[PDB]
Design a protein around this ligand. Structure first.
Ligand code: NA
Ligand code: NA
Length: 264
């Protein structure tokens, strides 16, 4: 099986491995993309894998140690790929490691998976070549479709709670105004909330975007009194099944999520 750290990396793997081997995802829905605790049985799955796919030690810190014992012909470390380096985005002294939100990095990931699976399973070269073909065709078609869906929303300002979507935003020309540090469970105290609400109004935000783990109460406490619309973005596509068309569905779903709140 191909074992991916995170569900959207599973989407990409499952396109290339389709009908060749299963793909499995380690990280549960709602668990920490950084600090999940791998169980002994996750380690075994990693070591048993035909191929391990992950972003790298600056994202899934939780698997760094476990993947040391695994040869390089059996792992794709996306942040270390030659074709990814120039696409890695540094800002305010930090690199964005949410690489599965970049269509171009997703394409280099698919290419790297394809290349490793072909060396490992030459008896399936043709199916794997066909799978990479279908993945790229669907990615091109989705890119253009999403591009057109989000083109008319340039200039609609918004804030997010998790500044994780920059690859997708910079690629499709979206206009985020900035981000608020907000606990998903506990709303901010009156002072900082006051500041947030006035920024929402001052900078003329159309929307504020939370993620599925935020309690609605906390999101409402933020948007209350402003007339800024509330949105939800799922950067992990927890509602999408693995499968050949899944990465494209993921990109399109995310487009819909944005468009839905920003549309006017
Ligand atoms: Na390079
Ligand atoms: Na983060």
């Amino acid at each position: 099986a191909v074992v991916a750290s995170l569900k959207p990396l599973g989407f990409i793997a499952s396109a290339i491995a389709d009908g060749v081997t299963d793909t499995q995802v380690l990280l549960p829905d709602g668990a920490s993309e950084h600090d999940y605790s791998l169980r002994p049985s996750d380690v075994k799955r990693l070591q048993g894998a035909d191929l391990v796919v992950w972003v790298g030690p600056e994202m899934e810190a939780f698997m760094e140690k476990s993947v040391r014992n695994i040869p390089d012909n059996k792992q794709v470390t996306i942040a270390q790929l030659a074709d990814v380096k120039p696409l890695l985005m540094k800002g305010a002294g930090e690199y964005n490691m949410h690489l599965w939100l970049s269509p171009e990095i997703a394409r280099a990931t698919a290419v790297a998976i394809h290349e490793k699976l072909v060396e490992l399973m030459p008896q399936s070269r043709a199916k794997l070549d066909a799978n990479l073909k279908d993945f790229e065709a669907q990615l091109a078609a989705t890119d253009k479709q999403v591009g057109n869906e989000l083109a008319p929303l340039k200039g609609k300002g918004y804030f997010v709670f998790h500044d994780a979507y920059g690859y997708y935003e910079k690629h499709y020309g979206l206009t985020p105004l900035g981000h608020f540090t907000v606990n998903p469970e506990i709303q901010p105290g009156a002072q900082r909330l006051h500041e947030i609400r006035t920024q929402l109004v001052e900078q003329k935000a159309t929307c504020v975007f939370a993620e599925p783990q935020f309690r609605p109460a906390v999101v409402e406490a933020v948007a209350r009194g402003t007339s800024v619309r509330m949105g939800t973005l799922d950067p992990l596509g927890t509602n999408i099944k693995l499968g050949k068309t899944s990465y494209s569905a993921f990109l399109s779903q995310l487009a819909n999520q944005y468009a839905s709140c920003l549309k006017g």
